[PDB]
């Protein structure tokens, strides 16, 4: 009926705002990115600091893991993405092509491709092996806030400040659907691929059937009017929607009822990123520059 997330660890180390936290697909690790130009790796279960990965010339808005947990990709203000070998910390490839800040990134499930979104209003699809840009999609008419592949890699969803969500055929780069005006600050596919979860900067999360163009659920109560705040489907226990908020709380809703089921308190700045562990009822959350910490929370359901 309600989860009971409680604070377990606070992970300090970043020297500026933390932008993104992601659990490795194997459940072992948490990666974080920061305005401090660094990626840090932490133990998912005990929060123990593992390593710092460096090389970007400016702050990093996003990081993402390959399916085998061996590679990371990062999106930076230095206009590049970088592919990293996690074990060695080495930069394998620098992905060059965007003409302004890179804000978001993801591997496809296959992990042979990376998708990126930029201030430059494009979505780019990159070859992991070669580091070359395969396609440049003229995706939006304002900054791209989020990019995500569906569970089989066949589709990409993008969101933008232009107020649109768009679904793209990965293979061809063709736009299959435009969902249509407040800025769209976050989007991702549901695990079953049928729905998209989208955040808009009028303090609203919406669950959409994008084929029909029908809004199924609306989640409100949190504050989201300024920052591109990451949200999640929590699926390991109860079926929840999880998001950060500009009031320094993590919000958790019941997906079906739309009721707030828990608010997690502890952060001292905007919670810009949340992540849900792949197998356990564990949440990671990260905050902006008044705080600079990552917190790990555990629930019994
Ligand atoms: C290095 C760093 C540290 C802390 C927060 C940020 C930030 O907020 N990112 C950002 C910014 C924008 C954005 C949108 C429109 C216009 C501008 C922007 O930045 C400068 C000018 C969009 C998305 C994003 N992100 C947020 C984190 N998320 C995991 C991916 C995307 C970045």
Swiss-Prot record:
Keyword NADP found: no
Origin superkingdom: Eukaryota
Cell compartment(s), UniProt: Nucleus
Alphabetical keyword list: Acetylation, Chromatin regulator, Host-virus interaction, Isopeptide bond, Nucleus, Repeat, Transcription, Transcription regulation, Ubl conjugation, WD repeat
N6-acetyllysine PTM positions: 82
Record location of the Glycyl lysine isopeptide (Lys-Gly) (interchain with G-Cter in SUMO2) cross-link: 16
Transmembrane segments: none
PROSITE patterns per record: WD_REPEATS_1, WD_REPEATS_2, WD_REPEATS_REGION
Biological function: Contributes to histone modification. May position the N-terminus of histone H3 for efficient trimethylation at 'Lys-4'. As part of the MLL1/MLL complex it is involved in methylation and dimethylation at 'Lys-4' of histone H3. H3 'Lys-4' methylation represents a specific tag for epigenetic transcriptional activation. As part of the NSL complex it may be involved in acetylation of nucleosomal histone H4 on several lysine residues. May regulate osteoblasts differentiation.
Family indicated by similarity: Belongs to the WD repeat WDR5/wds family.
Protein name: WD repeat-containing protein 5
Organism from which the protein derives: Homo sapiens (Human)
Gene: WDR5
């Amino acid at each position: 009926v309600k989860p009971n997330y409680a604070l377990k660890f606070t992970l300090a180390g970043h020297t500026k705002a933390v932008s993104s936290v992601k659990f490795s697909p194997n459940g072992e690790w948490l990666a974080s990115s920061s305005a401090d130009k660094l990626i840090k790796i932490w133990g998912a279960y005990d929060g123990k600091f593992e390593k710092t990965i460096s090389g970007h010339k400016l702050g990093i808005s996003d990081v993402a893991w390959s399916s085998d947990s061996n590679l990371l990709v990062s999106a930076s203000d230095d206009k590049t993405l970088k592919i990293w070998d996690v074990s060695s910390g080495k930069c394998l490839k620098t992905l060059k092509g965007h003409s302004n800040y890179v804000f978001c990134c993801n591997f496809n499930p296959q992990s042979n491709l990376i998708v990126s979104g930029s201030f430059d209003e494009s979505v780019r699809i990159w070859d992991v092996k070669t580091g070359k840009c395969l396609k440049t999609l003229p995706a939006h008419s304002d900054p791209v806030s989020a990019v995500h592949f569906n569970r089989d890699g066949s589709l990409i969803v993008s969101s933008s400040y232009d107020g649109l969500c768009r679904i793209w055929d990965t293979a061809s780069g063709q736009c299959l659907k435009t969902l249509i005006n407040p800025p769209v600050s976050f989007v991702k596919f549901s695990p079953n691929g049928k729905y998209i979860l989208a955040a808009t900067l009028d303090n609203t999360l919406k669950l959409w059937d994008y084929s029909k163009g029908k809004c199924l659920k609306t989640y409100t109560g949190h504050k989201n009017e300024k920052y591109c705040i990451f949200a999640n489907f929590s699926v390991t226990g109860g079926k929840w929607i999880v998001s950060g908020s500009e009031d320094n709380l993590v919000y958790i809703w019941n997906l079906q009822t739309k009721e707030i089921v828990q608010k997690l308190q502890g952060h001292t700045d905007v919670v810009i990123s949340t992540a849900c562990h792949p197998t356990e009822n564990i949440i990671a959350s990260a905050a902006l520059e008044n705080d600079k910490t990552i917190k790990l929370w555990k629930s019994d359901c």
